[PDB]
Design a protein around this ligand. Structure first.
Ligand SMILES: C=CC(=O)Nc1ccc2c(Nc3cc[nH]n3)nc(-c3ccccc3)nc2c1
Length: 260
């Protein structure tokens, strides 16, 4: 057992905030007067996630803090006040998010994902459900299960979905798809397309259209995201940089609109 391991004690669970799939997510207080997030639930399968999170630190990736390696097993990490980006965009505070905010958030996540590019790590689950928001419109990557050193198809790339080939380039696919919700106020992609329709449609060569009120600027970008050859797709250094400089070098004339 290692430095990351802690006594089951000094941590109680104040609240319960999730448990959609297998386990539980509460928000307690830790190690004195420290607020945390705890995940609960091959008892090891659950912790393959922090074995990964152990090796990664970035300010735009939710951070681990401790993990109770023994059952009842838990993973302690940094609490993010504003739930997950999905609920956030669909929900009440999402009404007043215009492009600037929406593009901003994007970059933070590109940025964390640029780092993931650095460490030769892959996330096979990039979707606004796996991004957590904080005070200040701070967004960080999460859901570190599924991640290894280098399966819904709306969010997933074809090579991977079909042949299991999961690059960072396949994470990149998911980023484009995610851009749309960011700009769709949380909508499920491929509206009215079912998981069979989506597969050869997407093979058919077919990409989503410009979300209403979007700038084609961001659409050629997503589009670049969905290129069929995984290796001509951009990267998170490129995306991150493109995203940050966007309203000065990209759309430096953008004017505010009703819904964006
Ligand atoms: C009006 C509703 C509201 O504020 N709800 C909140 C707030 C914070 C949540 C949160 N924070 C976490 C989780 C991991 N780090 N921070 N995490 C989670 C969560 C995350 C994964 C699975 C289930 C729940 N939900 C939150 C919900």
């Amino acid at each position: 057992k290692d430095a990351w391991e802690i006594p089951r004690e000094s941590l109680r669970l104040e609240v319960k905030l999730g448990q959609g799939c297998f386990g539980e997510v509460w928000m307690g207080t830790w190690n004195g007067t420290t607020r945390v997030a705890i995940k609960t639930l091959s008892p090891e399968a659950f912790l393959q996630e922090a074995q990964v999170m152990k090796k990664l630190r970035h300010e735009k990736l939710v951070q681990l803090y401790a993990v109770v390696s023994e059952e009842p097993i838990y993973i302690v990490m940094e609490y993010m006040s504003k739930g997950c980006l999905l609920d956030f965009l669909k929900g009440e505070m999402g009404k007043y998010l215009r492009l600037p905010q929406l593009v901003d958030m994007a970059a933070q996540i590109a940025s964390g994902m640029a780092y993931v590019e650095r460490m030769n790590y892959v996330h096979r689950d990039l979707r606004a459900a796996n991004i957590l928001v904080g005070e200040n419109l701070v967004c960080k990557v999460a859901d570190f299960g599924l991640a290894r050193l280098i399966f819904p198809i709306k969010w997933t790339a074809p090579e991977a979905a079909l042949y299991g080939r999961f690059t960072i380039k396949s994470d990149v696919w998911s980023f484009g798809i995610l851009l749309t919700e960011l700009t769709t106020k949380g909508r499920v992609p491929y509206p009215g397309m079912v998981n069979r329709e989506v597969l050869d449609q997407v093979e058919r060569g077919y990409r989503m259209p410009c979300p209403p009120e979007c700038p084609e600027s961001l659409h050629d970008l997503m589009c670049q995201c969905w290129r069929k050859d995984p290796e001509e797709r951009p990267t998170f250094e490129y995306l991150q940089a493109f995203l940050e400089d966007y309203f000065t070098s990209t759309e430096p004339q953008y004017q505010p609109g009703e819904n964006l």
